[PDB]
Amino acid sequence: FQKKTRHYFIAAVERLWDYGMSSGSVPQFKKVVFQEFTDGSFTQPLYRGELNEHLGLLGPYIRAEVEDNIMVTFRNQASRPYSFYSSLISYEEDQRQGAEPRKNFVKPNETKTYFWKVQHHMAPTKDEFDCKAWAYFSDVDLEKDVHSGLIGPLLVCHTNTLNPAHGRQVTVQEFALFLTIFDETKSWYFTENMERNCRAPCNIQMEDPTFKENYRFHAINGYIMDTLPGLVMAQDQRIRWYLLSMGSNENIHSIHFSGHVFTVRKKEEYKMALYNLYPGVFETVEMLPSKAGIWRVECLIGEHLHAGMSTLFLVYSNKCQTPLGMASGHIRDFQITASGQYGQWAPKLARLHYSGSINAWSTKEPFSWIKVDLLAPMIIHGIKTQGARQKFSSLYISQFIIMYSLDGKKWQTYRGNSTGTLMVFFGNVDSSGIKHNIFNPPIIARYIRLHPTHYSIRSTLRMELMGCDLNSCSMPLGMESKAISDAQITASSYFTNMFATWSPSKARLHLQGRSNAWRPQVNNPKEWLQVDFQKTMKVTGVTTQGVKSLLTSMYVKEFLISSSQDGHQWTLFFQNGKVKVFQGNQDSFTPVVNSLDPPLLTRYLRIHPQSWVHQIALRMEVLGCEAQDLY
Amino acid sequence: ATRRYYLGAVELSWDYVVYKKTLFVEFTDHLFNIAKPRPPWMGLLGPTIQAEVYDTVVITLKNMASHPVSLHAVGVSYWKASEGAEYDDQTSQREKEDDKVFPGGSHTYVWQVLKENGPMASDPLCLTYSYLSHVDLVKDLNSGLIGALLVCREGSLAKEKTQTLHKFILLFAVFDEGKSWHSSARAWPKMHTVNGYVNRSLPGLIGCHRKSVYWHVIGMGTTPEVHSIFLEGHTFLVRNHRQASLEISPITFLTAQTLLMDLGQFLLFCHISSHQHDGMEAYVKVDSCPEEPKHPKTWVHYIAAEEEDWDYAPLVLAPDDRSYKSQYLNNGPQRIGRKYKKVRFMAYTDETFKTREAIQHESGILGPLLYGEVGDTLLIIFKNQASRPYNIYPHGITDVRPLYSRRLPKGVKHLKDFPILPGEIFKYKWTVTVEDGPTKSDPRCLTRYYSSFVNMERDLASGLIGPLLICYKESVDQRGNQIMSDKRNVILFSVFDENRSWYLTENIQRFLPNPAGVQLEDPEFQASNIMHSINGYVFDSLQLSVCLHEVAYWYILSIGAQTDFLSVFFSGYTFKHKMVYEDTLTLFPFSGETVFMSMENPGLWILGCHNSDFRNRGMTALLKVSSCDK
Numbered sequence A: 001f002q003k004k005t006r007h008y009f010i011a012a013v014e015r016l017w018d019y020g021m022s023s024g025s026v027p028q029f030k031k032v033v034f035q036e037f038t039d040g041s042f043t044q045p046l047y048r049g050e051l052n053e054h055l056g057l058l059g060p061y062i063r064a065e066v067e068d069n070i071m072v073t074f075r076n077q078a079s080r081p082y083s084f085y086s087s088l089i090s091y092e093e094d095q096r097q098g099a100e101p102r103k104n105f106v107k108p109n110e111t112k113t114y115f116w117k118v119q120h121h122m123a124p125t126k127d128e129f130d131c132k133a134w135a136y137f138s139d140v141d142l143e144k145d146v147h148s149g150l151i152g153p154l155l156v157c158h159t160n161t162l163n164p165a166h167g168r169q170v171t172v173q174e175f176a177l178f179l180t181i182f183d184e185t186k187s188w189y190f191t192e193n194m195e196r197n198c199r200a201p202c203n204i205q206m207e208d209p210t211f212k213e214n215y216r217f218h219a220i221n222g223y224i225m226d227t228l229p230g231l232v233m234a235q236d237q238r239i240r241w242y243l244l245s246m247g248s249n250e251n252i253h254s255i256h257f258s259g260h261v262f263t264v265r266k267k268e269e270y271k272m273a274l275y276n277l278y279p280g281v282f283e284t285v286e287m288l289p290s291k292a293g294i295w296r297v298e299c300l301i302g303e304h305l306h307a308g309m310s311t312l313f314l315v316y317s318n319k320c321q322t323p324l325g326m327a328s329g330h331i332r333d334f335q336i337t338a339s340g341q342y343g344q345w346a347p348k349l350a351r352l353h354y355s356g357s358i359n360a361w362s363t364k365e366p367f368s369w370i371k372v373d374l375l376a377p378m379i380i381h382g383i384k385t386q387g388a389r390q391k392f393s394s395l396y397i398s399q400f401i402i403m404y405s406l407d408g409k410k411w412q413t414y415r416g417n418s419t420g421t422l423m424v425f426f427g428n429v430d431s432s433g434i435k436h437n438i439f440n441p442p443i444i445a446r447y448i449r450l451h452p453t454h455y456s457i458r459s460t461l462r463m464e465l466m467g468c469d470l471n472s473c474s475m476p477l478g479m480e481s482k483a484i485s486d487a488q489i490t491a492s493s494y495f496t497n498m499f500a501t502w503s504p505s506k507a508r509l510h511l512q513g514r515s516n517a518w519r520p521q522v523n524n525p526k527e528w529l530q531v532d533f534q535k536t537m538k539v540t541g542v543t544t545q546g547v548k549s550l551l552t553s554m555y556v557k558e559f560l561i562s563s564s565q566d567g568h569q570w571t572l573f574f575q576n577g578k579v580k581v582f583q584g585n586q587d588s589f590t591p592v593v594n595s596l597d598p599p600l601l602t603r604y605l606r607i608h609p610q611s612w613v614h615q616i617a618l619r620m621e622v623l624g625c626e627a628q629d630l631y
Numbered sequence B: 001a002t003r004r005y006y007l008g009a010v011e012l013s014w015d016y017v018v019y020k021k022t023l024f025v026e027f028t029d030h031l032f033n034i035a036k037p038r039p040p041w042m043g044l045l046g047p048t049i050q051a052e053v054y055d056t057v058v059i060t061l062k063n064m065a066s067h068p069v070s071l072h073a074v075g076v077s078y079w080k081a082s083e084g085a086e087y088d089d090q091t092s093q094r095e096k097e098d099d100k101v102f103p104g105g106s107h108t109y110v111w112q113v114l115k116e117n118g119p120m121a122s123d124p125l126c127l128t129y130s131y132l133s134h135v136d137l138v139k140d141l142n143s144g145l146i147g148a149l150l151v152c153r154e155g156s157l158a159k160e161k162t163q164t165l166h167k168f169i170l171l172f173a174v175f176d177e178g179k180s181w182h183s184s185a186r187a188w189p190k191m192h193t194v195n196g197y198v199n200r201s202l203p204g205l206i207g208c209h210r211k212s213v214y215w216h217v218i219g220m221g222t223t224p225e226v227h228s229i230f231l232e233g234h235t236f237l238v239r240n241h242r243q244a245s246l247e248i249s250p251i252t253f254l255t256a257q258t259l260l261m262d263l264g265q266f267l268l269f270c271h272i273s274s275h276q277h278d279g280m281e282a283y284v285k286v287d288s289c290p291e292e293p294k295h296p297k298t299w300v301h302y303i304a305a306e307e308e309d310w311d312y313a314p315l316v317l318a319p320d321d322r323s324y325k326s327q328y329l330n331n332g333p334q335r336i337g338r339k340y341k342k343v344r345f346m347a348y349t350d351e352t353f354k355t356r357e358a359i360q361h362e363s364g365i366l367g368p369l370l371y372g373e374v375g376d377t378l379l380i381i382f383k384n385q386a387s388r389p390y391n392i393y394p395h396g397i398t399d400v401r402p403l404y405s406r407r408l409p410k411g412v413k414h415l416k417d418f419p420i421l422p423g424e425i426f427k428y429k430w431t432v433t434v435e436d437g438p439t440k441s442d443p444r445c446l447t448r449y450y451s452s453f454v455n456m457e458r459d460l461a462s463g464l465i466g467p468l469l470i471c472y473k474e475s476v477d478q479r480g481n482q483i484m485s486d487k488r489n490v491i492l493f494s495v496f497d498e499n500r501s502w503y504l505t506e507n508i509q510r511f512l513p514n515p516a517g518v519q520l521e522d523p524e525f526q527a528s529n530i531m532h533s534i535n536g537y538v539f540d541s542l543q544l545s546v547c548l549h550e551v552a553y554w555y556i557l558s559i560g561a562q563t564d565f566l567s568v569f570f571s572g573y574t575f576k577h578k579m580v581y582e583d584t585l586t587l588f589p590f591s592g593e594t595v596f597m598s599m600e601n602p603g604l605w606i607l608g609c610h611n612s613d614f615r616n617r618g619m620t621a622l623l624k625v626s627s628c629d630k
């Protein structure tokens, strides 16, 4: 096991503070932020990924293990020169100096690069959590350069907790939360008061009841209207929260998550419902959000809530009603086929809460619709629907009907309990109208279409889906555990000599050896492999794989299946038309989630290889359980 | 089991002749019929509702008010068909009706405790949680909607049918009748106080004497408004992390316990200057009982209270009208590096109070470093050598009695009362027992202090401060006593408000040139003497010498600088307080806390505090680090 020197090419820039949701006179603001770049040539802006856009109006994650190396090659791009600073900023030694100028000052366009061993000083402990949380900010003016906008998160981890995949994730999913109450008597704000809001209609309110951030700013980042974006999480994969309050001396914030509870470590771990964040106290706390649906975080402090903390988070993942995954789903799943167009396109990006200007679905089309392949027959209990925000335009969909297909071929409309002819659904009312519709009787589908019945400026949408699975026996039938005896499987024929016996009794999803899989005596498509269940079974699908023969690769590319009740005559598998051309392997290893449209009820299952790689070679497994026994 | 609580919410008229609200009723209704548990400690309180780990509670609220009012929990799980919190959680038609009970409505409530929200393996037997109401969070609260809601392991109905427990719910709460449901002319709205028991008001009951009493304490308000609560006996549950004084903020609840001595209804503070006048109080009648039908050290201190002069900023000075610092000291003519006449504790060699005790020019104003492990006895022999009379009392120990007798100075109710005039000396005995020292959890040395108590700060502010250290047992045995235990060192965060000092206008005939315009009571001059400092030293005045690879404990406290709290700094350095590692210490005005530090970051470091509105009003020092020798 190794140590790593992990640099982070990072800088400081500006743009700032948007509101446009639903709740147009909106103001420009021009505060400073940290920003992660791509290399020394400070060019690639390093697009903030869907996985960390919650971070939003503060800086990128900087992360390390115990016996590690942290490095920051930093460029300032601004007016007032700023700097990097946190606690373990372990400077070094001494110098021929004049009372030790240890002053960190980073002038615009200059590059101040610093890097240091991260001792067990900064590390979390055996008593603690898998990772502790620390702040970095500009120390040029720690007072102003915090309302200005140089808040930053820093994570320090136990050894063997991160990945090749960057960051960690061993049942993780982390989020930071940055609760301040920003104010502009701080940082260059002069270049805002008479930069915008004033021309020849000016000279109105100097510092009398004007309070422009105690007119607004109650941060949970600075996407902190009463709604910030990226709080996507799986209703299990237990989520760690990084709460760090900052600001001034009224900046106590007491946060909680409705209908959820979390555990905090210290001496031990004791269970808590809300946490008085203090300024300078960098909390880590974890929870297991086993209640599906759509919630929020709020600083419970009366007057704070009532000017910006009611800031949503969504859980999708099962019991049963979780978000079906639109934050936690499928990067660019499914969309339409002509219905939907406006440069800033359709889905691709039409999810709930998706922050930005290029955000959601968008079509000035009297005849429209969008389509989600749930990639499996699913229960859909409801649909949270919301709208977007334009130039100064409020635009959304006001009315909609919902059609679904369980199959793809023949569709039809919907008729939520005893309505009339057709189930008319009520849309949004603004650019943040999360109007969680529920399906009165539920819906079982694979595909859902949404069709507008009236729009604002454009048929315009962003949405999540409510529900969860039916729960078929997606559990290994006994090929792996070998609950199915070596006796219990024959094949069409087996290859055999002296240095090998590739008998059918070897076809096992992961099996090592000299002869570690099934092989036919020669290579024919009308060749097969047969499982015999000593009883009557129900099947989801067969997991296929090839063999690593130390010789060459061997695997099966395409196959067929056949079923029987008698075990001597065979009714084979079909699509909605001809036989099922099965999408099989491509390597010595790697298995295949290959399942069946009509769950096959049988007792005699036969594999029918069609196309292969070098020889026909099979390590495999069946998924399922059983209905009644034989009759 | 499966528990039901059929109780709605009402409008009621309140008192102790000023102010009438909306409360949270208690009653056995199907309609509107009386039903009361409330007599004692229950103030404005929806009934303390208790459910165990595996249970399922059903509140059904009947609303009666001009108010649209909700019901919403914390610390518990439920379906989006409760929550009781309006905002677009998508929620179908019937899933939002829990969110706001339209005025004079009626709604059922679906409440669950799962395993995942029961209390953790080792902590409070029973968790502190409250039940709120939020439609208009600010309104619903200040008005008067709040109750206690408790949750704990498999056995209340069964192991409190057979168990004995002395438990109350104290609701430390700050309703503001200007933020009520409610809206020439001279007398605008007000309140600020415990359980709803105002000013000095007192509630009800007590617990038995020879054992322990548990209180689920719920923090309240509609603003960032911190308190700091006390009474006699230590208040040792936080975890079994073992605390000087319950310290409550915005919205706070964890749950704590204490022991007892006898009948003395013990005094119940909010103990801060600002909250005081309009503050919180209640008694505690600790009575007799129903249910019966390498040894220990001996320390010595000769300390005198004694008048001297204090230059807060000697080393460094550079004023004119050139700064906010330039303004400090005597706002008439005199205004350079700032000199006042103070009275600080100072210890002598022996009864012959003659031999000057060599000083610790790092502790500045601070008294001699007092220390005593559990089991020891402090014989503290104390002379006044300042005219205007004072005394000595340690916030920490409870067994403090005059040396030889168990008398009370001929007349007074207890020593922190009146005693010691100019000249006269008193022999005090401080005996320290396990109860006032640390534990198998804390550090090994909790931080405390001694003030004088003839006047409170009209004393203290004038210089009466010194650090008291109570500690775990050890001597060439126990833990860490094989080559050396590296020395003890104290920082004191203190605003001295000369404006109150028992040397008030004494000091104006002094340093200030001419009272030929004897001006007093002023906007800027009052601000001109509020001295935000660490050990009297201010504005990077005498810092501290240390070196790298050196390692020892810091003991720190907030005193005199009140009305507020202190998040505290240390540039680039990090400490192990509470056996975690944090970089900033949050400190109240009781605030005794004890950190530990590996000194190995060479350079100037600007120790101050994480609040950047005093560290400009002074309130900063420096620290230096560089290799040593030995």
Ligand SMILES: *[C@@H]1O[C@H](CO)[C@@H](O[C@@H]2O[C@H](CO)[C@@H](O)[C@H](O)[C@H]2NC(C)=O)[C@H](O)[C@H]1NC(C)=O
Pocket (backbone or CB within 6 Å): B199, B200, B277, B278, B279
């Ligand atoms: C209890 O509350 C009453 C409320 O009036 C306090 O009475 C006055 O408070 C004003 C504050 O503006 C002070 O100027 C006076 O000291 C009080 N005057 C009267 C008429 O008594 C009162 O201070 C409170 N009691 C306590 C605990 O001191």
Ligand SMILES: *[C@H]1O[C@H](CO)[C@@H](O)[C@H](O)[C@H]1NC(C)=O
Pocket (backbone or CB within 6 Å): A076, A077, A078, A079, A108, A109
């Ligand atoms: C370099 O950065 C700062 C940003 O304010 C500025 O002084 C200067 O104009 C920049 N250099 C360029 C783009 O020529």
Ligand SMILES: *[C@H]1O[C@H](CO)[C@@H](O)[C@H](O)[C@H]1NC(C)=O
Pocket (backbone or CB within 6 Å): A417, A440, A441, B093, B094
């Ligand atoms: C629609 O019918 C279902 C059938 O049980 C019912 O549960 C639901 O309450 C009805 N929808 C309404 C009136 O909200």
Ligand SMILES: [Ca+2]
Pocket (backbone or CB within 6 Å): B080, B081, B082, B083, B084, B085, B089, B091, B095, B096, B097, B098, B099
């Ligand atoms: Ca609801």
Ligand SMILES: [Cu+2]
Pocket (backbone or CB within 6 Å): A252, A253, A254, A299, A300, A301, A304, A305
């Ligand atoms: Cu807050």
Ligand SMILES: [Cu+2]
Pocket (backbone or CB within 6 Å): B226, B227, B228, B270, B271, B272, B275, B276, B279
């Ligand atoms: Cu108070």
